[PDB]
Predict the structure.
Amino acid sequence: WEYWIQLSLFTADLHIVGGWNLATPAQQQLFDAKASALKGPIVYSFLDLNELETPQSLENIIAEKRVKSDWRKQIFPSAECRPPFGFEGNPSGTFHVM
Amino acid sequence: AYRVLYRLKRADQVLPTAVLEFEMKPLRIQVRQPVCEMCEVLPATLYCPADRAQLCDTCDERVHSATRMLARHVRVPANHSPLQFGSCPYHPSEMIDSVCMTCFVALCPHCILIGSHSAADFSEHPLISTLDAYKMVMQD
Amino acid sequence: PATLYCPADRAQLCDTCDERVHSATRMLARHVRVPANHSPLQFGSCPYH
Amino acid sequence: HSVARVRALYGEEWRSLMVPSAAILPYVDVEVTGPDTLKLA
Amino acid sequence: FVRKTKKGYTPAELLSHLWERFFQTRNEVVEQSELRLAALSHQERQEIETGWKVAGQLAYRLIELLRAGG
Amino acid sequence: GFKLSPEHQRVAEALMLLRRLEDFRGSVQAGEVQRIRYLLRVGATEAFSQQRYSDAMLQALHSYLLAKSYYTAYQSAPLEGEMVPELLLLVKCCGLAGCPDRGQEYLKELRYIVENTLIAEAGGSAAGNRGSLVGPIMRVEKHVLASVVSSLAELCSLYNQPDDARLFYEKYVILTKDVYGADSLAVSDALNTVALYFFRTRQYGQALPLVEQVLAIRKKHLGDFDAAEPHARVADCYANIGLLHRLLGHPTEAFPCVLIALDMRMRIYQTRETSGVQDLVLALGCLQHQAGHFRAALEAYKEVWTFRNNTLGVTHPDTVNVELLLRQLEKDLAAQMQEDKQRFV
Amino acid sequence: GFKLSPEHQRVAEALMLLRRLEDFRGSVQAGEVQRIRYLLRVGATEAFSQQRYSDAMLQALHSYLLAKSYYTAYQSAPLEGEMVPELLLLVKCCGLAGCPDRGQEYLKELRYIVENTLIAEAGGSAAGNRGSLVGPIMRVEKHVLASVVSSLAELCSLYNQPDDARLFYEKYVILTKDVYGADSLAVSDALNTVALYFFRTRQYGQALPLVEQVLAIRKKHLGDFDAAEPHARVADCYANIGLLHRLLGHPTEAFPCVLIALDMRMRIYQTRETSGVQDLVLALGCLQHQAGHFRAALEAYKEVWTFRNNTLGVTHPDTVNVELLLRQLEKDLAAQMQEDKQRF
Amino acid sequence: PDAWHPASPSLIWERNSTNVGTRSTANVFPFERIQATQASETRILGGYTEQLTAPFERVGATSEKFAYNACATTLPYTGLWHDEVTGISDPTLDSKQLEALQKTPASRAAEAALLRSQAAKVCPRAAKVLLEELTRDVPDQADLQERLFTKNKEYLSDDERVENFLLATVQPGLALGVAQKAEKQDQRNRRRGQAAAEAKAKAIASF
Amino acid sequence: CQDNPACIWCPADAARLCASCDELIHQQNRLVSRHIRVPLNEMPRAFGTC
Amino acid sequence: ISYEETKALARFKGRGREYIPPKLTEETLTLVHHTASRNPLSPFTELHDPIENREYADSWRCPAPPSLGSGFRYSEQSGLNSPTPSDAMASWFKHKKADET
């Protein structure tokens, strides 16, 4: 996943600090079986936590166990991504994507 | 600059997978300098592929020149040592010297002998040296 | 004395003449020019004539 | 072998009166500029 | 190691100065050229340029040898 | 790791300076690379500049590899941006001696450095994607970076990559506006450079709107048509308007542009027998010849041929070429007479 | 392995004891605090001697953080004492980098201790009765405290504070007068050192009187004009007022001074091929140029150029200084010739 | 891409005046959809590969000359890398006497306007080099000596002067010495035009 | 000129020049007037596959 | 599968009988690491790292970029530099002491 965000931002100095699996291993094969029914791929999209339709910091998702954002009315930036929110004023810190 | 914006019809076609927390400052791999197998004298660069010992300069003039045996023994210099690519991320004691050409993971001797790749089905996989791997990517 | 010899023009020229032969049209400015001691005419007597 | 080597020694005949000196010349650049007094004269 | 000559040179930067003068005469001789330089393969031109890179390497190494002692 | 207090982050850059000096001055290999990279660059500049293009290959490549070998053990970064000077040597001498597959990855290597300086300097993401967010940069001040992106795009058009050649030229325009202003003569020079590129690539269409901006800037921070004393630079640009607009196909409102430039150069250079004034007399002959109008383009062609005969010679390419316009006027007039006078059916 | 070589070893556990004190008070003893502190200090002194300033900064910084984690913060009564040499290593290595305002409190704390030792020593036991301050009056002997004054005084110049360095140079003059007496060669050298600063900061005008008492004490102790044997230092200081009177205008009251400093250098250097004579020849040449005689200082300028080419480098700043003077003389003589041309 | 759009005036004339459907036979070259050879390719096979050795560029077959030459005072070129740790700098200038020396001379008024403009503020090291060049040209406290020792305090050290000779020989404009040769040429052309005026204009008319 | 069809391939200039430009760049001063000039048929190029 | 099956069952792929695909081919040794990141505090900030064999590197923007060290002048008034005209200013002043011993 560290190499994924390295490719998505095209730059070669990134690192993963800590991962939080917002999934279930049983959910992936049901996601795949629904996919083969729909006849399509599983292309990725890397979204900043405050880039969502409603802003939601990392402590909010983990505490109340839900994502409170309507994803049927949301654009999905795929592959190359914009610089994360928290740039020039903080040119080197820790950020978040999902 | 390939970037595509997607929009889905139904909310079931999107699933959360992970939140990744990522820093920004660069940071690089463990480039170790071994000392010697006999001497601990010079910043060490010569390697013998036959006898696996990273043993620059020092006593090579006197322990590797004995008979017609020790004369041949190619002495590939310039830090072309398979024991210099960093630790194994599971076992932080040995150095990555072998690489898998089926599952494609970096394996130290501990990571291949009783490591994750020591299973029953992980037996027929080709295992070339790591310097053979790096030269392969260079010449395509 | 010749200072630069152009092999494409097969002629030997000085500095004041290289800038008037090859520096007029655009296809002549692309000519590579070598120093005059690379000239082919320095080997010469042709002992028959 | 011979013919070429012995001819080289016949070239040594006319280099016999030819001796290395003891000059040690360190050629270092010296600049010319300054007041020219033959102009002023 | 510090003593000056008739032109005011330490033994260290006398060598640095004559290396620069040898370099200026080098570029002058190569530009006037002989056709032995023109008749050179790419491997022999490689071996010449490795030769003058290492020649500059040992030139500075000798400069530091005549300087660091003093 | 033992997390630091903010007093260490307060000092910070003082420890930056005092370490990179000590290991530069103390290791003999650091001054080794600095001296040899200097001498190999001095030989390579003079090699490229005169006629060689092949010794300039090997000295640039050697200063590249010797710097890189130091840059892989002193610090864990092979590209460090300071190898741009002989990178520019490598690509231009590859393209001129001729081996494009060797200088293709050097143009590639020079490329990834350049957008990283554009993005690290600019206000944010903005424009200029494709080349990542942080990477090998150079700390050049901006007037230097203007000629850096301008020289790179010249190399991009030297190779067969016309798409990104125009991309870097418009950033060369937009970056000289930052240092000299939105209304500076140095910026009008920068627009004139891109207009020169469009003209040399046969693309006369996009060349003209840039030269209109060149004329607009020079008309403000310089003279004008009358302007009491006029300037030769406005007269040059007015000639460029008429020349580039005739090449598009419209000859009837390019005629006033050459008329202004002729009257200005009448008072800059005076006389009637200058090489400059015969440029615009020959331009009125060519403008007339496009829109019919015979027996008057003949006298404008004869005037510029008689001056160029007794000044430039009889076999000069500026005298034979106009004589070809005489012959091909003779073919065209014979065509017109054999198109509108034989119609007795 | 990553041994983290021993000069940075004592950096590591010293910062670890900073954490250990902070997160759990009471697990600290005075013995190991000064043990790690003195090891950081002896390593910093051997680092500074061999030009390693990056680790001299690093050990002196972490000694100061460990200092203010101990008695400045932990047990309220400070009794500081040992601030000064490790603050010196911090202030010096700041000012060598570039520091206009990043070592400002570092200069201020060291200054506050140094001005304390000046006041409490100038007044006899002034600390014991009038305003008992925190500094220990250095708890050492007199001449070391003098070198501490000169160390800070050259540090204010490295911190571009000219007035502040001027006052500390002044108390450097006063206090070396007290320990060595009015007539001593140590005072003549210390007042000479202040003249080096006033030369270095372009303030030639007020530097004249203090070099004059340097001349007075050299004449009193070593020798006057004749003096039988002339000592090189009275020939030196008398040459120094010749250069000083030359630079701030005033051509008239320097020509006799240059003349007999030259004559004194004849007797100690009985040659003509030394830099001592061939710098006063440059001095008399400049006085010869400004009042006319264009073909009389040209000799004096060739006198010096044929020497600095012989004994110094061609690219030496002193040698190329003469060549710019000869290019000057080429165009004043050209202008004087032109003025002769229209006047004919 | 784009179509042909020929450059010679006659080929445009035949396209825009003569129609193909009026004759049984026709030389029909300025009517075909010839393609303009794309961009970079015309630069290689045409000769647009190097810097302009002259202050013009000739136009195809019509023998015209498109004028390109400098019009402005470019800031003096500095090095292709500056070793500088950010935060620790003094990029500002002591000013005062520096702009006083800017407004003294008259032959360099355009350079003086450049130093007082916003170009000095955006990049300060180019202003430092140009100020040292203007102060080097000033005519003649501190009797001799001092005035020339503080004069040779040259700022661009050894490495960057060569490293700017790169950026002059690779920059896509006029070559080095072309601008000075052009300036020398039209000055002499102007005095020749001034000679057929005055000594020929007023002197011959009103004798 | 990029204005006329090619008629002469000159190996010395390495250009696919036309007839009008042949007069332009080969009828200068005498040095460049003696290049071997052949038509575009005889330009060295590959024969081709079956 | 590996190399063994993908060569003999994909290059031939069940085809046969007339195809025949083509041919088959100072500065001595110290045990201390010379750190890549030249912050003196870079081994003394953190290691926020799930992997372990991973030192730091200096960022290309914030403190200073990776460079050789050819420039980097000290403070001008300090006398630890190349001799400026401000440093050789006191060359004709003669600060050498009389006597302290």
